């Protein structure tokens, strides 16, 4: 039975990665409110933190969160293979990162602005406001807002 109570060790709505986590949901599906964290990248991080996956966010400890931080911004360290990372072979760098938090679109604006100055056709599309992966813009996406 999972029916345990405790009392005042429970805390809902805590901050992570300069963003604020939901109070109570299964932690894998909890931390995902941070951009750069998917339904899996949270599933694999929580396992490596020895956290109960069927516990809830307001549970665990204060330090167990601080360990989840480590595995997230140091993913290549914790046996998480490179292909589980979004940032693999990052442009000029060559290293495999995982871009997280509010850092996600900053790295996104970076490659965007990168090939904007390269003036490739794929980038020009972004500047025009058009579709890049594209295909037919003929009949699709109209009244785009």
């Amino acid at each position: 039975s999972l029916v345990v109570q405790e009392q005042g060790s429970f805390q809902h709505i805590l901050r992570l990665l300069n963003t604020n986590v939901d109070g109570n949901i299964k932690i894998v599906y909890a931390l995902t409110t941070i951009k750069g964290v998917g339904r899996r990248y949270s599933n694999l991080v929580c396992k490596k933190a020895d956290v109960d996956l069927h516990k809830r966010a307001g549970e665990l400890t204060q330090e167990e969160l601080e360990r989840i931080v480590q595995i997230m911004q140091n993913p290549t360290h914790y046996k998480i293979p490179a292909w589980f990372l979004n940032r693999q072979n990052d442009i000029t760098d060559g290293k495999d990162y995982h871009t997280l938090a509010n850092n996600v679109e900053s790295k996104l604006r970076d490659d965007l602005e990168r090939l904007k100055k390269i003036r490739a056709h794929r980038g020009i599309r972004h500047f025009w406001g058009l579709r890049v992966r594209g295909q037919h813009t003929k009949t699709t996406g109209r009244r785009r807002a």
Binding site: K116, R119, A120, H121, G123, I124, F127, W128, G129, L130, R144
Partner: peptide, 29 residues
Amino acid sequence: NEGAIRDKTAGRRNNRSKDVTDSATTKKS
């Protein structure tokens, strides 16, 4: 591609500003 991305002119917001002609709806014979 220089004037292409340097163009003010051509764009989406540019076309999205002015509105559609009457020719979109026309047919028969």
